[PDB]
Design a protein around this ligand. Structure first.
Ligand SMILES: [Cl-]
Ligand SMILES: [Cl-]
Lengths: 169, 169
């Protein structure tokens, strides 16, 4: 009900996750990502998903928090008990993404391109398989942010600009 | 030009124009839509576009202004002189635009659904024809906005939060 829930999904190379981290700290909200949600599942891949959804909804029911990745926006959009859900998609030019991935993963240009194609494929297919909707589709979000010309900080503040407007802060 | 230029493109029934006008007033800035642009060109379907484009650039060059509609984003983006552009895509869930089209055009659900399909199709083809690119696509905009859960003021306010972040205000 009351709790503020923010879901950030994103293009690989956008820094969506980092933007999620920053934002969790500056707001003091608990933070759950791909890995934590993955390891969570251990605490049929259609079971693994069902399990992971019920976990997501439980957290939300009992805390404010920020989820990153794994069709979190879809899942929580289904939960009619949640009132303060804000769904973000972070996206960016290839040129900027290749440079981030090159640096953050220490690979070259070619390798970086292939990685972006691959993780984005994974994210898209995951989403398609489980929601039946489309990961890269506006309709699935409240606010898609183009960070082509933003710092991750500006980006974080835009999300705060938003939480504030809604009166959730 | 350090002139602030905003371009709003949108799904039919999203109130992209509505939002365009509030901002126009709220900011003390001139406002230009399809129809003014339409009547503008006049005094090929393809000469027509090259003409129209030039008027927008001249308007943008003479003064700060808001454009609603018709590949405004892509066009004003060419103008190398424009130093302060913001490109926005307004959009909304299906229910809400159906309600809007019915109310506004004073027509049925059936006709409202149909007229949405019609107008949007015109907008995709128009866009791809004159830009080579795709109309309803994120990478072509700075800020897509989903108004599904935004009161009008909230929307206008979000666009200004953005302007402030860009330091255009
Ligand atoms: Cl994601
Ligand atoms: Cl449009």
């Amino acid at each position: 009900n009351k709790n503020l829930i923010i879901t950030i999904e994103r293009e690989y190379g956008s820094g969506g996750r980092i933007v999620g981290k920053k934002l969790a700290e500056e707001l003091g909200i608990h933070f759950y990502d791909d890995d934590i949600l993955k390891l969570a599942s251990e605490k049929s891949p259609e079971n693994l998903f069902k399990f992971q959804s019920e976990v997501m909804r439980e957290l939300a029911e009992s805390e404010p928090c920020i989820f990153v990745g794994r069709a979190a926006g879809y899942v929580l959009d289904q939960d009619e008990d949640i009132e303060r859900l804000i769904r973000i998609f972070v996206y960016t030019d290839k040129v900027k993404k290749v440079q981030r991935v090159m640096e953050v993963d220490c690979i070259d240009e070619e390798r970086a391109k292939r990685r972006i194609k691959k993780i984005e494929k994974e994210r898209k297919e995951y989403y398609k398989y489980f929601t039946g909707s489309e990961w890269h589709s506006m309709k699935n979000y409240d606010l898609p942010i183009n960070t082509t010309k933003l710092t991750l900080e500006e980006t974080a503040e835009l999300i705060k600009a938003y939480i504030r407007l809604k009166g959730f802060m």
